Enzyme design. Structure first.
Site, PDB file in Angstrom:
ATOM      1  N   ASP A  59      -3.627  -0.840  -9.265  1.00 41.92           N
ATOM      2  CA  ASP A  59      -2.453  -0.132  -9.778  1.00 41.92           C
ATOM      3  C   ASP A  59      -1.934  -0.687 -11.103  1.00 41.92           C
ATOM      4  OD1 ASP A  59      -2.644   1.457  -7.568  1.00 41.92           O
ATOM      5  OD2 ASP A  59      -0.915   0.618  -6.521  1.00 41.92           O
ATOM      6  N   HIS A  88      -9.251   4.210 -12.006  1.00 42.84           N
ATOM      7  CA  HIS A  88      -8.316   3.875 -10.947  1.00 42.84           C
ATOM      8  C   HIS A  88      -8.840   4.334  -9.594  1.00 42.84           C
ATOM      9  CE1 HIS A  88      -4.162   4.336  -8.920  1.00 42.84           C
ATOM     10  NE2 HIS A  88      -4.391   3.042  -9.057  1.00 42.84           N
ATOM     11  N   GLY A 122      -4.112  12.406  -9.855  1.00 45.23           N
ATOM     12  CA  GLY A 122      -3.552  13.285  -8.850  1.00 45.23           C
ATOM     13  C   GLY A 122      -4.275  13.363  -7.522  1.00 45.23           C
TER      14      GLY A 122
END
Lengths: 121, 121
Positions: free
Chosen positions: A89, A47, A29
């Site tokens: 990603d 990530h 987030g």
């Protein structure tokens, strides 16, 4: 960009990305990083650390090329930063799918102000 | 319902379902059947004949649940009609993916062209 990432997540996990991963745990987030709360959250941690190594491109705005061949994400950019970005990603989408076995909804909108500091990348 | 269908298509082909199959050939779309233009077209011809066999449930509105475990569509509906419905959708999603090699955008349209009477289902 967020559009590619979001589409990769759906293709791999089969879940609505924003819904299940828009604000999951301490790392999935907008609230920066935080001590991961479980496997899924750890993916988002890695990530975000992957994003920090990109030179010359923006993960939010910059779009890139990739294909879904035989249910496999295949990055296809000439640009090194854009290629690496695509690989960051792809890696989290696959990770999220691999850890669907312990995904906890009680974390979907977990309150980050409860998270502990995260180790530096 | 249309919900699961489009999702299944996107998951198997990785293509935008509306853009690539909402108006393709003589069977992919919302304008009935017709003489298939090619394999992709044929997939949709079969899908529609699949619906016709359903007895009771509404293919466009009735929602069912399925799994994407290990990037494979698994129907798990305890409801017969709904199960038969889910298999129809899974079938066309897989067929559309398998025939991407011959997918020809030349067959897209805004206004459905001429289509010889597709034989009965």
């Amino acid at each position: 960009s967020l559009f590619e990432l979001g589409k990769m997540i759906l293709q791999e996990t089969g879940k609505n990305p924003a819904k299940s991963y828009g604000a999951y745990g301490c790392n999935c987030g907008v609230l920066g990083r935080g001590q991961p709360k479980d496997a899924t959250d750890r993916c988002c941690y890695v990530h975000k650390c992957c994003y920090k190594k990109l030179t010359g491109c923006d993960p939010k705005k910059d779009r890139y090329s990739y294909s879904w061949k035989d249910k496999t994400i295949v990055c296809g950019e000439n640009n090194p930063c854009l290629k690496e970005l695509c690989e960051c990603d792809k890696a989290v989408a696959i990770c999220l799918r691999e850890n669907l076995g312990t995904y906890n909804k009680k974390y979907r909108y977990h309150l980050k102000p409860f998270c502990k500091k995260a180790d530096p990348c």
